[PDB]
Design a protein around this nucleic acid. Sequence first.
DNA 1: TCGATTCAGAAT
DNA 2: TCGATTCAGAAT
Lengths: 165, 165, 213, 213
Amino acid sequence: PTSKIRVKKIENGVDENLRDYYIEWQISFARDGKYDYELSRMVRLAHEHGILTYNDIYELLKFADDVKSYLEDKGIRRESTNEELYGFNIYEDVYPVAKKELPSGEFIGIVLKHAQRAVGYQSMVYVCIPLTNEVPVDLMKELLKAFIIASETHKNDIVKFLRSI
Amino acid sequence: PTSKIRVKKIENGVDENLRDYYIEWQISFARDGKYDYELSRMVRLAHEHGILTYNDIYELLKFADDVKSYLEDKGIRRESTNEELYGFNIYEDVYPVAKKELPSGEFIGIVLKHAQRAVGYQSMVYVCIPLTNEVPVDLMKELLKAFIIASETHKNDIVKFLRSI
Amino acid sequence: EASVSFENGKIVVRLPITRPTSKIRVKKIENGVGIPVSTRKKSFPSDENLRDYYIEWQISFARDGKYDYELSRMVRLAHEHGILTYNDIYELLKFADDVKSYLEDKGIRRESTNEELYGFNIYEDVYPVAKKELPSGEFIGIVLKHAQGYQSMVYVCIPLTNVEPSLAGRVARRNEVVKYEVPVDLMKELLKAFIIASETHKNDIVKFLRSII
Amino acid sequence: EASVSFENGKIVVRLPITRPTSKIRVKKIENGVGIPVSTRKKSFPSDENLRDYYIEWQISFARDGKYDYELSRMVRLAHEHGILTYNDIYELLKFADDVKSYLEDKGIRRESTNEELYGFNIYEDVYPVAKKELPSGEFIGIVLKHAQGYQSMVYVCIPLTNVEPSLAGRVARRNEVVKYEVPVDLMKELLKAFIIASETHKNDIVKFLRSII
DNA sequence: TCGATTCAGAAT
DNA sequence: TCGATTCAGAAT
């Protein structure tokens, strides 16, 4: 449960109860500088097997071409509120998340955190697979678009990988 | 710590405190019917390397020849006492243990337990090695004599092994 | 775990008989000692020696600092259905006020001997136990062991003739548990066993009994 | 762990500055955000921007259900040496009797947006924090997160200019911890932070303060 | 595998 | 390795 792949269940929003159980996977794109780990493996393996076609990469490359805003551009903002809690000033930290559900049940989430060790932000992609649910083809394509809309760093990393295959 | 080999320390009898720390080893003689595991390995390996001589096996075989009483013969006895603890009769269970200290510091203990699954007793040999302390030659010989004085079953098993080498 | 329930004015517990490595195991005495029994391979006797067979149950009172476990569940249900009365609990607490020596006071000791085993020093470890036979047939045991100070554990031994169904002349079934109607005196004697076992156990019995009064 | 002690009429605590993955880490603010600092590779500035450097300490009150940890150790020593007086503790408990709304009452919520990211739905998770600047320079923070219900954590941020030795123009030493003399108002404001953080935290402060009075 | 227990281990 | 935390794992 302490890995990037862990099983959780929906309780208070955070038999037929087996739909509430899902696997959360903190999925990566690259490792060791080369694009042959997790997602980049699925994508190349599917592109080699004809599961992903030549036209499938254009749609992703063209879609990447059209993208200007990214999730990290929203950033984390600490908003002042005019409230006082017995001499303590109250604020609100606004974290932005992008969510997308797939017809088969799987969710894709992209969350933002303050860039550790550096100044800026760090974005991460998650896939939540129900225990009632193998990788659908549309899953692989939305995971790529997840990384393409996360940050320009991740987008340039995805664009660079697609032109290779 | 849940294995037959575990580290303990002497506290209330049960810097210079490193002498109180020792390794307790529930040591076996045979495994899988053949005499090539733990003690039986040490004994054969030492006998092959000349560490144990031909005369060393006679002393053990002759000593085994002279042995008639065994630790399991004492058994566990529940002794009645004439005491009553508010309507409850008090008894005493007398477990017998054989102990022997070696000049280098190591202790050898043989304890008795009711034969699990069967009727009778089961005996087991322990060696307690101080953390301040490699196997001394005299250690191997007293471990054998430990098994020879534990029970006739263990003695016949040790005698059978010594005649082979 | 054993199931505790209430049916027809009795506290009954269901005891599994095919878990020989649990705290509930079936034993048979051969010449005064208890020997465990493979209830699925050996088929129980159809005769009088069936009384020599029994269930040994290491019964606890507390779990996780709460009194919602085994004996505390039996006593509370017995309380709620008037099986254990006010005076029943009152006599127990007045018994606890009078108890002042405990089984753990006997301690565990290693005794030196005049005996030697071919160069090996011989010692005798002496452990105290408490045993009580009840007219209904059960035995209650308290043994003392070293804390893994001392810790005392309570046992209750239930003859197979005191449970249903009758296992006479047959082998136990897969995952078979067995129904045992708990006499009120046994619940009282079990609370007594914990009272006299140690002062620590007594304070748990006293603190629990006072909460339901 | 940080060392708590008493020297020359002051409660002082020793804060390690080379454990950046602990609950005590050295940060420096760049344009309003805190960024962690490699205290062994980057050598601290010898100028005014040194005030922008600080130690962020996630301070706790209880550990293992006992109040012998960090803030509870500082408050008890302060009590025993007359640093924290009877009226000091009395005013705090009368302050706790008056506190009736808490930071955890604000909750955490996920807000829907009119925004979309190329087919991806966009949400805003809104988390409440409480911040207070003290005249002595320190900041006290309370952030709310989800219980791994809610759990609230108290932070205290100590400017590097408020500790000795002076790290100006030098790099931290191996396993270097740093001496910080705790102002009495900060101990009081820290107890206040726990009082208003949540009702659960308040009951711990109240129950602890009443025990030393 | 269950059964018992509590430590050490995996996780990043 | 430390740091944080709690689960699952090794043990027989």
